[PDB]
Amino acid sequence: STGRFTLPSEENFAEKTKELAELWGADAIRNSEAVLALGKKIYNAYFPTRAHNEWITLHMDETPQVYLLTDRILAESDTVDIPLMESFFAEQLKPNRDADPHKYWEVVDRTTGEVVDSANWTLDADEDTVHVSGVAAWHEYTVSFLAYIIWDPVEMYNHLTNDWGDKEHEIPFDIYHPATRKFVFDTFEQWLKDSPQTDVVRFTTFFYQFTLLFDEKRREKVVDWFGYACTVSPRALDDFEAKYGYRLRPEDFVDGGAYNSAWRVPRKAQRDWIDFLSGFVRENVKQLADMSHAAGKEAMMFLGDQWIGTEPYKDGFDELGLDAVVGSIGDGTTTRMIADIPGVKYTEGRFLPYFFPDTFYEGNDPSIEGLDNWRKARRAILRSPISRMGYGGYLSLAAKFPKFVDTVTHIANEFRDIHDRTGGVAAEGELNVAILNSWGKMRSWMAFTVAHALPNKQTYSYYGILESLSGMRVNVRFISFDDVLAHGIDSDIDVIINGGPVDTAFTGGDVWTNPKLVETVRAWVRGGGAFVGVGEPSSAPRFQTGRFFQLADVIGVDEERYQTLSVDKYFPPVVPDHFITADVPVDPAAREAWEQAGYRIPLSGCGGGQSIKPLGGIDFGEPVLNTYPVNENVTLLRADGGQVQLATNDYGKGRGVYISGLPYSAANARLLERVLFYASHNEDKYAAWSSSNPECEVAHFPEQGLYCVINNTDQPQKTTVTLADGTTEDFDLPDSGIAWREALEH
Amino acid sequence: STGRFTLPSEENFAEKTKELAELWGADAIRNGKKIYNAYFPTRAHNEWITLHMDETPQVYLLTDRILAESDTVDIPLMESFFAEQLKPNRDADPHKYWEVVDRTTGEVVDSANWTLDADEDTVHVSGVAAWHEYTVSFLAYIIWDPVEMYNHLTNDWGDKEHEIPFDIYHPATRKFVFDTFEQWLKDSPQTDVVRFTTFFYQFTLLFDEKRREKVVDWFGYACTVSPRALDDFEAKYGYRLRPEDFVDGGAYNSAWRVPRKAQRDWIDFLSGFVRENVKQLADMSHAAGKEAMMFLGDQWIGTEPYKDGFDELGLDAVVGSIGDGTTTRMIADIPGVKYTEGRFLPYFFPDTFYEGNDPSIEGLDNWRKARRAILRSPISRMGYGGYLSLAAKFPKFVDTVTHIANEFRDIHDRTGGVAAEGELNVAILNSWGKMRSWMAFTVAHALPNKQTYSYYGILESLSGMRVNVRFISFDDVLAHGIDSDIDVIINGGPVDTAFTGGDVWTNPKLVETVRAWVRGGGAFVGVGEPSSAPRFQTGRFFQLADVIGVDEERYQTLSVDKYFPPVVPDHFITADVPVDPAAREAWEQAGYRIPLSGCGGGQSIKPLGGIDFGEPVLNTYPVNENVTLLRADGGQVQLATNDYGKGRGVYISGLPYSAANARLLERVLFYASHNEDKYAAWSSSNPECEVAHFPEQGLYCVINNTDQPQKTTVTLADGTTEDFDLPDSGIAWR
Ligand SMILES: CC(=O)N[C@@H]1[C@@H](O)[C@H](O)[C@@H](CO)O[C@@H]1O
Numbered sequence A: 001s002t003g004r005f006t007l008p009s010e011e012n013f014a015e016k017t018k019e020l021a022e023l024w025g026a027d028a029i030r031n032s033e034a035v036l037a038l039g040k041k042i043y044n045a046y047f048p049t050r051a052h053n054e055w056i057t058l059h060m061d062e063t064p065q066v067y068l069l070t071d072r073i074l075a076e077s078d079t080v081d082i083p084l085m086e087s088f089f090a091e092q093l094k095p096n097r098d099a100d101p102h103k104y105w106e107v108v109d110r111t112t113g114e115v116v117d118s119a120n121w122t123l124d125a126d127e128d129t130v131h132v133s134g135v136a137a138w139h140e141y142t143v144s145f146l147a148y149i150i151w152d153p154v155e156m157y158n159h160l161t162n163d164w165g166d167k168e169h170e171i172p173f174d175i176y177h178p179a180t181r182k183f184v185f186d187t188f189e190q191w192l193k194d195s196p197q198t199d200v201v202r203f204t205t206f207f208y209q210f211t212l213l214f215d216e217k218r219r220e221k222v223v224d225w226f227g228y229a230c231t232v233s234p235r236a237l238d239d240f241e242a243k244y245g246y247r248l249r250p251e252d253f254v255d256g257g258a259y260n261s262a263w264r265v266p267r268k269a270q271r272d273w274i275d276f277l278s279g280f281v282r283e284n285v286k287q288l289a290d291m292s293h294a295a296g297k298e299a300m301m302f303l304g305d306q307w308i309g310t311e312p313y314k315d316g317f318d319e320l321g322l323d324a325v326v327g328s329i330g331d332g333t334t335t336r337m338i339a340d341i342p343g344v345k346y347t348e349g350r351f352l353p354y355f356f357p358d359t360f361y362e363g364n365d366p367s368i369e370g371l372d373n374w375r376k377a378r379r380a381i382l383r384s385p386i387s388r389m390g391y392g393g394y395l396s397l398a399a400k401f402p403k404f405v406d407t408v409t410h411i412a413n414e415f416r417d418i419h420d421r422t423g424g425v426a427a428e429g430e431l432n433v434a435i436l437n438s439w440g441k442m443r444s445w446m447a448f449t450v451a452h453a454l455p456n457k458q459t460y461s462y463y464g465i466l467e468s469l470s471g472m473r474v475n476v477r478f479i480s481f482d483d484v485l486a487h488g489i490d491s492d493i494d495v496i497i498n499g500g501p502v503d504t505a506f507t508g509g510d511v512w513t514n515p516k517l518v519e520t521v522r523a524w525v526r527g528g529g530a531f532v533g534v535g536e537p538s539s540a541p542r543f544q545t546g547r548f549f550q551l552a553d554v555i556g557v558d559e560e561r562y563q564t565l566s567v568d569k570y571f572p573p574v575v576p577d578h579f580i581t582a583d584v585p586v587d588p589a590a591r592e593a594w595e596q597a598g599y600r601i602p603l604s605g606c607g608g609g610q611s612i613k614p615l616g617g618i619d620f621g622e623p624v625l626n627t628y629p630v631n632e633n634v635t636l637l638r639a640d641g642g643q644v645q646l647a648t649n650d651y652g653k654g655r656g657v658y659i660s661g662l663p664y665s666a667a668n669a670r671l672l673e674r675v676l677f678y679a680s681h682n683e684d685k686y687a688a689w690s691s692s693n694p695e696c697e698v699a700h701f702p703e704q705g706l707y708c709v710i711n712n713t714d715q716p717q718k719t720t721v722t723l724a725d726g727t728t729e730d731f732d733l734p735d736s737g738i739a740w741r742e743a744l745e746h
Numbered sequence B: 001s002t003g004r005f006t007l008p009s010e011e012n013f014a015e016k017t018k019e020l021a022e023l024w025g026a027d028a029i030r031n032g033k034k035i036y037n038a039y040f041p042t043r044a045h046n047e048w049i050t051l052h053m054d055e056t057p058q059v060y061l062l063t064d065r066i067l068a069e070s071d072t073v074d075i076p077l078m079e080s081f082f083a084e085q086l087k088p089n090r091d092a093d094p095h096k097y098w099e100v101v102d103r104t105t106g107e108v109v110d111s112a113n114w115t116l117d118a119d120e121d122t123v124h125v126s127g128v129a130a131w132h133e134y135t136v137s138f139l140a141y142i143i144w145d146p147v148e149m150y151n152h153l154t155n156d157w158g159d160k161e162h163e164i165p166f167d168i169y170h171p172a173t174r175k176f177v178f179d180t181f182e183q184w185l186k187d188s189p190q191t192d193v194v195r196f197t198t199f200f201y202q203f204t205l206l207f208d209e210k211r212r213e214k215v216v217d218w219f220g221y222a223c224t225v226s227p228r229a230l231d232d233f234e235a236k237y238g239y240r241l242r243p244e245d246f247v248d249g250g251a252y253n254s255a256w257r258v259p260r261k262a263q264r265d266w267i268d269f270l271s272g273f274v275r276e277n278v279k280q281l282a283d284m285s286h287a288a289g290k291e292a293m294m295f296l297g298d299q300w301i302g303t304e305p306y307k308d309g310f311d312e313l314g315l316d317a318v319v320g321s322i323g324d325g326t327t328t329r330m331i332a333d334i335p336g337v338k339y340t341e342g343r344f345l346p347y348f349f350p351d352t353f354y355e356g357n358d359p360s361i362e363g364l365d366n367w368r369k370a371r372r373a374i375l376r377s378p379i380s381r382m383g384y385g386g387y388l389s390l391a392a393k394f395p396k397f398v399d400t401v402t403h404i405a406n407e408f409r410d411i412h413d414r415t416g417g418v419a420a421e422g423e424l425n426v427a428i429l430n431s432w433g434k435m436r437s438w439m440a441f442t443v444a445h446a447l448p449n450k451q452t453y454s455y456y457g458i459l460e461s462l463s464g465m466r467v468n469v470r471f472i473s474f475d476d477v478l479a480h481g482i483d484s485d486i487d488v489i490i491n492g493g494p495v496d497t498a499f500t501g502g503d504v505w506t507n508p509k510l511v512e513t514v515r516a517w518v519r520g521g522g523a524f525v526g527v528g529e530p531s532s533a534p535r536f537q538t539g540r541f542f543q544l545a546d547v548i549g550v551d552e553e554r555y556q557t558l559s560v561d562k563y564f565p566p567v568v569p570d571h572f573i574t575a576d577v578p579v580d581p582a583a584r585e586a587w588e589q590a591g592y593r594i595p596l597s598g599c600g601g602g603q604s605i606k607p608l609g610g611i612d613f614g615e616p617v618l619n620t621y622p623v624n625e626n627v628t629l630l631r632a633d634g635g636q637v638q639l640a641t642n643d644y645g646k647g648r649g650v651y652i653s654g655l656p657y658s659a660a661n662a663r664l665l666e667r668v669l670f671y672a673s674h675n676e677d678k679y680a681a682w683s684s685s686n687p688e689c690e691v692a693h694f695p696e697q698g699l700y701c702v703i704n705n706t707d708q709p710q711k712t713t714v715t716l717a718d719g720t721t722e723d724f725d726l727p728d729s730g731i732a733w734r
């Protein structure tokens, strides 16, 4: 067992490097001499838009820029003054005074939405303050302005996170401006000649940084891992106007203060900017990779930091001729974002923990996180294989941890053995599942994300859906409403999933008032399709007084919006024993207390049929208030506390399912998997290649005559696997184990 | 110890009726004392209406959504309605009076493209789009009086003849109703009070095919139409109401809906007609030496006893059902009549009066909820209803009633029937204003539920609080600003309702007016989703987030870190909230969240608790760090206060009624208005007791709102204090 492993190294550490490389089977070492003689592939970081304060300080007007939105200021009379910077980090951001503020900025009456006239406001010469006159008392006002980014955001993040205190703040730069651009390509040509020992240029990353703004208290103020805020300049804006035939407003970037969060329903202006900026970016990335290839070296892209405008899931990404993409393995979902990228020769995972004093300190046990991280990646990898694993940081730190070092030895051999046994071919998927949202394929595995791998109270009930699926024995694609309006639903999809809050990219907004969309979905379901809706699926506010989820008729459930309180809701009896809930641990105490307290008897203005006490047993995450069954032919599987959390509904040949929320857990992934088989009328096809125990999952490889079963926990798991022919085999799986077995070839 | 009491009679219980009338101080008897008789103007005459069946009341009904699976589809009309109550009107031209809708698109289906089946109650529709949902809106005869129906179904009267109602908008039936009443007056010479139960139109009460309540609105005008009135409406207003203007997409004009022009128009038109006819009945009663008394319920639609001009009807009295403090105030606060009467609970019926039950429990409990409200707004008369002999079986109950009627009068004698002193002027702001006084947040009378109780509680708390409450409308505020005697404006409810206001919060004139007022010293209390308006501003959902220091994340601003300042556990507002030393400690020790990327920080990792806020408003948060958070558990805000110039805004996410929660609100009130030092005066240390002060009679009292001994210390205005030890629902004076 050797290879597919990238080892970090450091100055004055050649013995241990040699030792570890032997131990872990490393065929590549990453940068940070007697080591260069070891024969390995050599990776070297490259930071195209920073690491040259000597230049940018002589061209400060070519730093990158961002539109920023001030706090709202209440006018208590016909004039108002607006500080521009009271709410931002001055070390990070500076108002751009060089470029005519009347041409490129916007004062706005947020109370009315109206743009204040240019003649009515002046920028103070001596203070970062705007004076407004001729305005309305008791309205709120804001300025939207261009600010130079005078400190690279991620280095800033690392500086503050590590308290580098004294150390010099690295200034970033923007190759949209041609002097700076030339600087960057000369510097890169030069560096290649000065680096013959390097084999892989590890671009970390490219030209534009994802939205990451900090406030006057040195905290994160705004972030979006997909954000295009930090991509502007007067010349880019003006070139945009000429190319697209309309002028973007600053509002098109600040977006009422939302800064175009990917959760926002996508506006045409947004996408145009992505088109514009991404073409500029893509052309220049291809240059870097051509130059790389001409120096005999490979080009590798970090999925992160300055990755904006690359758009790896959009078409043509392959025309870049990038060799590889490497990324942070945070979980299943983030593993899949990497794995699934097409148009590279190979993919690579930077696993956790980062070799750093934060997790490598005396008394802490890094191997727990090591294995847990591997376990979450491994389940995904069986569905979409990455090519290489590796670690990052100070190798000397991890060397002081014997147990960890042995843990890695284990993971490395396992990773290789999964690859050798499988041939790097993805497990067979038993069902075709499509996530449907406004973004589709360009945000594959990127839905519900805000900051990378950091779900929170607001997102985790939907993120749970992707996490569950990332490792699930199904084929997962991402499709858009434009996809559906334009081409219908491809005939191979078994299930369509639509989840999220109302008025988001992930439910779709007012596209649900488009009858053409509603027709396509209804016909497909009726004909045999399956629609799973989570949260407020198919929602459209105000369109129909008495109908919030437009496909309430398909999933059998709607959400009361305080418009329909005069209409009693009659809940049919909950069906607690069902295919879908088959694996939910039963709790005798809870079940008989729920049996004993009965259903509510009908009563005026209150409807009836609602369990007086909760059945529970399933974590559905954040509640959707007052969901109810549209009539009594819907099957209710959970309807606790006066509303619906899980329901199924027959709809001609097809079915729809409602689920209020789905945090990730071994149990909920089992629930979701069951919903998928049940809604697609594929109860029959469920048992083939499955683990009876939900803590484990099964991967079939028909062309290699194989199947494995994996333990997703750090505890022993016994499970019963069922093969296609009906036969079964028992298993006792150790802590994080795996087991292979034959099955007829094809 | 004499009078203000109405007793119910019976057939043969003549001996014990004299004795109860003497023990209770009854000065009136219902069916030598003052005699009441129920009158049912739109029912009890099947002999008449059986021959005039096109003159029963009518209502527009919305069918179920029927999915079309090709270019035609059939819509059954009655599958979802109780056929013993409602019958489709085949007489009046359906293509003129009915509407077929493509719900999926909103479009009215051309009437050329549908027909009514000659033999089934089913509409055939052609030329439709497949995979759309379709409904019919159709006129229907109400052939079974809704309340009588309800009482029949509830008691299982079996095959007892169903009462068929009638609609006096039709002139032949009007004459009949008036003639009959003339005759009836001449035949009841010993009847002193005519207790109209009620008048001409029943509040919306429709039942389903399974004999269950289908639609109800206590304020609802669904049951008030006819081809005749519809055509007349057109001729007076110059436009034709659509069937949609009644079924309202399935909402049937629920009071929670933001009012539409067509809605208020209909209320004016119908209300005109009811009031003149109600005046006539009141004149005829008066001409025959009798009082007219109105039951605030059942067939009360069109009377609008809170709209200007109610007094011009000449009603001598309104009687109403005492369900709780709020419903008491509904009756109490009515101007335009000489006196008011509450019918108390329990009703004298076997469902409470059992073989081994203690109904005196229910009795005191009903009186406690009422008397706290009565102290603020006095009702004139008290009374009960049902079967006196059932009530007469339970001596402990009889001795309870005696005790209550005494108390009830003693309050009257002691206070000249004058409303106690209110220490603050509180106005509730919503789309309806005065005309829905004490009627906000209600669907079915006295039955709050999951969806409403977190706001109903606001009214139930106010109903018995030592403050002056009025109800104002957006139209009031937009036309006349804010009256300068107001200290506090409350606005509460979910987004897109009449109670929050809907898009009126995008009218800069409203924002301006409230803002300026608060800035200069006013106080705005916002409950639930105050001032909410969807999609107007991407970054701002509560238009007055700036005033109260809170907004609700609507999933558009997730890229913006929220920073919750630390909670203030020791504040005037929360002073009477106990906290378990241990719970507090657990919260103190778990601390606050460290800023984390795309997760903000400052949210307590554990909850402080101790306050039932009812239904959560998900993802409320502090707009800045200068807002004072009083409770912000589970990653969001439940209670907050914020200084705004000389004034204050305050957010509460919800407030189910209880004694604690009224105390919490009352403190909110004094605090927001910079009246903290005006608080202690005429106050009870214990939240389970309350204190009314009556300067003019040089008097105050203190009541126990519970069935339990309570010890409270009362602070008077000079700074002195008496200690009370009140027994079960007791009361003391000074
Ligand atoms: C994959 C990626 O771009 N990760 C970045 C990480 O590099 C950065 O340091 C952090 C700062 O909050 O944000 C994101 O996690």
Ligand SMILES: CC(=O)N[C@@H]1[C@@H](O)[C@H](O)[C@@H](CO)O[C@@H]1O
Binding pocket: A604, B147, B150, B151, B296, B297, B298, B321, B445
């Ligand atoms: C005050 C009032 O209108 N009370 C009525 C009651 O008479 C009727 O029987 C009931 C039907 O559910 O509705 C209301 O509670």
